[PDB]
């Protein structure tokens, strides 16, 4: 604290720093920051404390289960060092109130989130503000730390991070071969009944399958009765799968179930078929109480930690798993696949957080030349290095974010894709823009999407071909919140597949 080079210790005690997220690395980072000398710290996180979090996030206890991770963290740190100017934000970093002017307050920004969408945003905010970003991530025994500064190093999106698997609807509900396909179907099933009605998440058998030739309105008209929804979802929808004989020539598709047939005949233990049908009935009744408190058609956001929500997905995925002759898996085994649970321990977070402040001290010393990317392995490599350091790479000249004039090329069907698909699934989802502004390169500035509310809602249903968009049409996408401008080249293609709406050349 006091024992540091005097110019370095002055920059720490006066400089302002930002922590994005109070998760695993978040708690260890606040500690190492305060015990080093950092007194001006801003912490922002939206999640709340869960009983599963207090094994590695020591700033929280069983007393604080339910409260926000940001408010409790500010209270817990003011105990061992009350003279700490810490500002706690119980908000999302994606909120437009945290503009480039807000990010430019800090001399250092450090990431502590797990999802790429928010990390892509914080990456683009720290570039626009030209404030160094220390990106960090943990996974079991492994962890990584790197430094991002505009014009010096490559940004978070200079290289494509590994994307998860996405299975098409024709494979999810018509030919589910892996146990994961039943879990996605159960997560689909929970969304149709007690969640927001999604289009691509249909659980009913698909009739337009290439290998071939409302559910919620019925769910709400049935009264959410467990006995009735069982027979319709597990036998009738399977019998309409038997209507289509073309798929079943290759593999076996038995067998439909029956509530009166199977019910009469430590989460790590795989139960029988008679038990999962009972938890399916129990889940509907418990989720009907969680839905009765809500009003005006309010939905229920699925949570992996929610017992009633977990009991439904586990029982529904296992019953369908037994339906399609697949060997059923356990509840403890499926909770890791349902909610994408990343196993994390306190030691891995502590080691990574210590490396963050060490890299931060080199940034505040002007020693950005000495900054390194550090890998925490599980066993020593042939160089006997458990912590492997390496130099930072220069910015990628072909990145679509931090380059001079980024310019992507999208291949899609112009007469099929709507403008709403362009806004949500293309510009905001794939390209991770928060509040986008898209116009057509044609001299007049044909406005497709506007940042302000509903200025372009009359265009969402319209197809892209209704605006003269053709093969080679150039769209200028702007996210002034991120101070980011992207040019989208349009290529017209009709040979993509009925489950593929677009694709990027790369």
């Amino acid at each position: 604290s006091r024992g540091l080079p005097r110019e370095l210790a002055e920059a720490v005690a006066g400089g302002r720093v930002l922590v994005v997220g109070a998760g695993g690395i978040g708690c260890e980072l606040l500690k190492n920051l305060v015990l080093t000398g950092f007194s001006h710290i801003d912490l922002i996180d939206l999640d709340t404390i869960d009983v599963s979090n207090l094994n590695r996030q020591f700033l929280f206890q069983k007393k604080h289960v339910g409260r926000s991770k940001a408010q409790v963290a500010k209270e817990s740190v003011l105990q061992f060092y009350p003279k700490a100017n810490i500002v706690a934000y119980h908000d999302s970093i994606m909120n437009p109130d945290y503009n480039v002017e807000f990010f430019r307050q800090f001399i250092l920004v450090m990431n502590a989130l797990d999802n790429r969408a928010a990390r892509n945003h914080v990456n683009r905010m720290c570039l626009a503000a030209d404030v160094p970003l220390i990106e960090s991530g943990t996974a079991g025994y492994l962890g990584q730390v790197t430094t991002i500064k505009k014009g010096v190093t490559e940004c978070y999106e200079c290289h494509p991070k590994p994307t998860q698997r996405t299975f098409p609807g024709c494979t999810i509900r018509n030919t589910p071969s892996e146990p994961i396909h039943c879990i996605v179907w159960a997560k689909y099933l929970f969304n149709q009944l007690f969640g927001e009605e999604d289009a691509d998440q249909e659980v009913s058998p698909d009739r337009a399958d290439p290998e071939a030739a409302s559910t919620k309105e019925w769910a709400k008209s049935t009264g959410y009765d467990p006995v009735k929804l069982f027979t319709k979802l597990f036998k009738d929808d399977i019998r309409y799968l038997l209507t289509m004989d073309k798929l079943w020539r290759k593999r076996k598709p038995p067998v439909p179930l029956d509530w009166a047939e199977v019910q009469s005949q430590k989460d790590q233990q795989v139960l029988d078929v008679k038990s999962y049908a009972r938890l399916f009935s129990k889940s509907i009744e418990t989720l009907r109480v969680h839905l009765a408190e809500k009003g005006d058609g309010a939905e229920l956001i699925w949570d992996k930690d929610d017992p009633s929500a977990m009991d439904f997905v586990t029982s529904a995925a296992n019953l369908r798993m037994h339906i399609f002759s697949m060997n059923m898996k356990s509840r403890f085994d499926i909770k890791s696949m349902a909610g994408n649970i990343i196993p994390a321990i306190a030691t891995t977070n502590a080691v990574i957080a210590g490396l963050i402040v060490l890299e931060g001290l080199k940034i505040l010393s002007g020693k950005i030349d000495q900054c390194r990317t550090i890998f925490l392995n599980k066993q020593p490599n042939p160089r006997k290095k458990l912590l492997v350091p390496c130099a930072l790479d220069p910015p990628n000249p072909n990145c679509y974010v931090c380059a001079s004039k980024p310019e992507v090329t999208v291949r899609l069907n112009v007469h099929k894709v709507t403008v709403l698909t362009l806004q949500d699934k293309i510009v905001k989802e794939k390209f991770a823009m928060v509040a986008p502004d898209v116009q057509i390169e044609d001299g007049k500035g044909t406005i497709l999407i506007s940042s302000e509310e509903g200025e372009t809602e009359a265009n969402n249903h319209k197809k892209l071909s209704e605006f003269g968009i053709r093969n080679g049409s150039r769209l200028q996408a702007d996210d002034f919140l991120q101070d980011y401008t992207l040019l989208i080249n349009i290529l017209h293609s009709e040979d993509l597949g009925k489950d593929v709406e677009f694709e990027v050349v790369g």
């Binding site: 500690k31 599963s52 094994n55 020591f58 069983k62 196993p343 210590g354 290095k385």
Partner: protein, 312 residues
Amino acid sequence: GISEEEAAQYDRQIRLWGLEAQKRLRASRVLLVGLKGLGAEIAKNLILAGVKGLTMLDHEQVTPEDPGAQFLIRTGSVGRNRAEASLERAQNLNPMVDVKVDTEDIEKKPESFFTQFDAVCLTCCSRDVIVKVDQICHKNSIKFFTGDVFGYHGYTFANLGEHEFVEEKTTTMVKKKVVFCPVKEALEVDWSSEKAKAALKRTTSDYFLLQVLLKFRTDKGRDPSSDTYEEDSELLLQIRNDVLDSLGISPDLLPEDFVRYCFSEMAPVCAVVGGILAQEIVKALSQRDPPHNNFFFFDGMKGNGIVECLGP
């Protein structure tokens, strides 16, 4: 047979090292001396790990030279015992771990005191204390660990004797053998051979830095401080000459500017070393992953975490 309150708490780590290795960890008690900068880090992620009990031992009293260097000590605890002032905070990290506190110094403990501990971790001890305790632990098949922090540098040592663990690759389950050596043999290496000279070039300089600092803690009852830097470096600049030649090694093998990056307890260096050292304690009590044999040297400046084996 764990309760339901322990299943939801340790849920994220049971999915990492299994349930059986967690039950082996639940029935373990660890002895930790040197409740300070590094000791507080080790004690934290050990009580969170889920051991049965942790005994924090430290004879030195709270000196007003670590105002925020330790987070287990609330403000204004000068004059109180360092282990007692760290009890209430460490106990709240996990109510299912009875955190015991000892006041008598580690030197005046009989051999029968250590028998109740499945593992012992030393911190801020002189060489003679580290050798004394490791010899006692190796006599009674007790797992021995030690480590310290100096500026941007740090080290961890482990001695488990004949330690059999269980790794797996493919799912599977494989047993292996790893034999450690007492710390006295790892600190005094015969650096005169065709193998010894050839293996010396591949050895990190933090090991000889550890020798110079242990010799400093031996000659004077404290590590070098920032206030005495004015000529604590000159003593360090002469211990490096009067020790490296005693082992028959070139003097400038350890760089000369080392007296500027190993002079205090830096909280980031405590979390890194404390996280690695405590993880070696967890995988040892559970007898699961292969532990590091037998040193681990950290360099916070270059970002190096080198695992050395300098026993034989």
